[PDB]
Design a protein around this ligand. Structure first.
Ligand code: NAP
Ligand code: NAP
Ligand code: CL
Ligand code: CL
Ligand code: CL
Ligand code: CL
Ligand code: CL
Ligand code: CL
Lengths: 333, 328
């Protein structure tokens, strides 16, 4: 009988980003949630993800609207038999502490989830970033064993998974990241070579040392000038998997000088863009099962860059874009 | 026998000019056993020379292919009177040991000028053939966009696309070329220099986008094209002539948004990838299509060897409608 009010705090986009996003570009809001109707569920955020795509997606957002994003949430109350109270779901509810859903876009976490594995992994290694790495490496680059893979943003969510999957498939992997701490971490988890792209004397020389015979596949997470230099190091018929281009996300209106036609033509390179969502159904489930299996087998180690508290979400996002994160950037409510 | 040759006096900076070239005359030594004396008949000028020249040491002879006649021979495989395709560079006479020489397709029809062996029924025609059929991999019904459409490669791409049952849109740099493109079969053709907006022109030519873009120009044009590609669309990077004069200062790169969200497949290629029987078969097809009238042709002929640099300079500037060819 007793009814208790549920307050939902949400992070809104106060002002569109100009260059690097800043705290002031965000505005916290609180709203009293209405009662649950039949077929609806009340969700309470447990772990919220901040991702690079939010920098671009925020452009199609009207100022004042809630920032987009996925989170792991617990069903606190339920009037929907498919999502019982207490169950855990993945929801594209945006940056909010509580959310009422009719169950439409909700995704149940992988069945038989191990107690030892934090639920937040469903937002990284055993989630979208991990799936991105899986399909970009295995399908787009199509590695079969013995090839040499280069991966940028190597100590990041996607990058760290790419390198480890490449290693378990029997490939040689070289990684590029932005800090000495990250480089040490990469060598710890199996990367054959790794270098701090910020402190190189020569990007080209760094790549040459890492792999003298060149690269079979380049999993591109950064684009820009880095991509331009990588093309000269690709093996003939090499493949470039265009996953993202974070180096230009803050300057989409001032794109740097483009790639050289010389390398693309003479080396007959294949460049392909892809989005995780191209893979669905059974193939997507098998990928999740594989990622889970590989984590349980110790083949894919992980690390989460946790930011405590919902009120610190803008900071977690900003800092992730700036490279503060080693592994998946996750925010605990 | 005094051979005249065009040398690179000074590396090109931006647009190449006449003074960058220097004509040299040398008396040739006698032929040694196994050698032959070639006499240039038709010499080709091509966009790639603008890039390959960067690797040359100043004073060296410009690189290139030509159709030549054997006028003196000490090699049984090439008796006097034979016609060959030789990579002899910009020269009126050349001594070869025969190793790099290529004989023209057997059964070559008298009605077809020999210079076609340097174009439509040669390297440029093969580039169009393989880039369209293998790189774009069109099977029929697709909408194909081709830049430098009225050029040597472009003109063949558009016509092969048409005979394969595709819709073809071409972009070129003059109204004269646009009229020509329509007369030979292109479904749509526009002047990229005078259209109010490249994007509007592309949209009007194909409201539902493009399945394959045969890229001969690159640069800003390519960047604009990406937004009009259908999802999973293929771009055949054949060339990027719009940046050949500014390789050291490339224009803004392509948008990651288009490549990623549309999941585009971009692939560079070189004609030389296809060799042997497949290459010979392609030449046969091109030959047949020309004889059947499916592939019409036009050559932009410049008279006189002394005018070779001008032919090269103007071709890069877009003066040519069809293959740029120089008669000795
Ligand atoms: N196509 C798809 O479906 C898809 C899906 C998910 C993600 N992506 C893309 O995948 C990439 C990685 O995403 P993620 O979620 O795994 O993020 P993440 O790598 O965990 O975090 C982003 C990382 O990017 C690096 N970075 C920031 N600015 C940079 C710059 N100017 N140059 C080079 N590196 C820079 C930083 O590492 P520092 O030490 O290394 O430099 C930062 O930690 C992003 O480009 C993202 O857009 C694509
Ligand atoms: N990968 C390979 O194996 C291979 C082989 C042969 C050729 N190619 C490339 O294929 C392309 C066509 O070669 P081709 O022999 O057939 O030459 P072509 O097209 O007969 O002549 C070059 C034409 O390029 C156009 N052009 C020049 N500057 C331009 C600019 N800034 N923007 C747009 N168009 C410009 C001009 O036509 P407009 O009047 O239309 O501007 C000019 O007539 C070149 O890029 C060449 O490098 C590649
Ligand atoms: Cl924004
Ligand atoms: Cl911006
Ligand atoms: Cl930071
Ligand atoms: Cl030069
Ligand atoms: Cl230059
Ligand atoms: Cl001209």
């Amino acid at each position: 009988s007793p009814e208790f009010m549920v307050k939902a705090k949400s992070w809104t986009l106060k002002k569109h980003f100009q260059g690097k996003p800043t705290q002031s570009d965000f505005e916290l809001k609180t709203v009293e949630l209405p009662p649950l109707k039949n077929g609806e569920v009340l969700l309470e955020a447990l772990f919220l993800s901040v991702d690079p795509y939010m920098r671009i997606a925020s452009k199609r957002l009207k100022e004042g609207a809630v920032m987009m994003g996925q989170q792991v949430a617990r069903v606190v109350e339920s009037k929907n038999s498919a999502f019982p109270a207490g169950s855990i779901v993945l929801a594209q509810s945006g940056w909010t502490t509580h959310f009422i859903s009719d169950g439409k876009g909700l995704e149940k976490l992988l069945t038989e989830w191990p107690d030892k594995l934090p639920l937040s992994l469903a937002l990284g290694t055993i989630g979208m970033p991990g799936l991105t790495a899986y399909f970009g490496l295995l399908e787009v680059c199509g590695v079969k064993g013995g090839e040499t893979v280069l991966v940028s943003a190597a100590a990041g969510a996607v990058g760290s998974v790419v390198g480890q999957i490449a290693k378990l498939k029997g490939c040689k992997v070289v990684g590029a990241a932005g800090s000495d701490e990250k480089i040490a971490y990469l060598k710890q988890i199996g990367f054959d070579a790794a270098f701090n792209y910020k402190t190189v004397n020569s990007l080209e020389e760094a790549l040459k040392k890492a792999s003298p015979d060149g690269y079979d596949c380049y999993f591109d997470n950064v684009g820009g000038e880095f991509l331009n230099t990588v093309l000269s190091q690709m093996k003939d018929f090499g493949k470039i998997a265009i996953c993202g281009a974070i180096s230009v996300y803050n300057r989409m209106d001032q794109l740097p000088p483009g790639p050289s036609p010389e390398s693309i033509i003479y080396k007959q390179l294949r460049i392909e863009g892809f989005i995780v969502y191209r893979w669905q159904g059974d193939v997507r489930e098998k990928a999740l099962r594989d990622l889970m299996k590989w984590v349980l087998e110790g083949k894919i180690q992980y690390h989460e860059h946790v930011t405590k508290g919902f009120e610190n979400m803008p900071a977690a996002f900003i800092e992730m874009l700036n490279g503060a994160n080693l592994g998946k950037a996750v925010v605990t409510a």
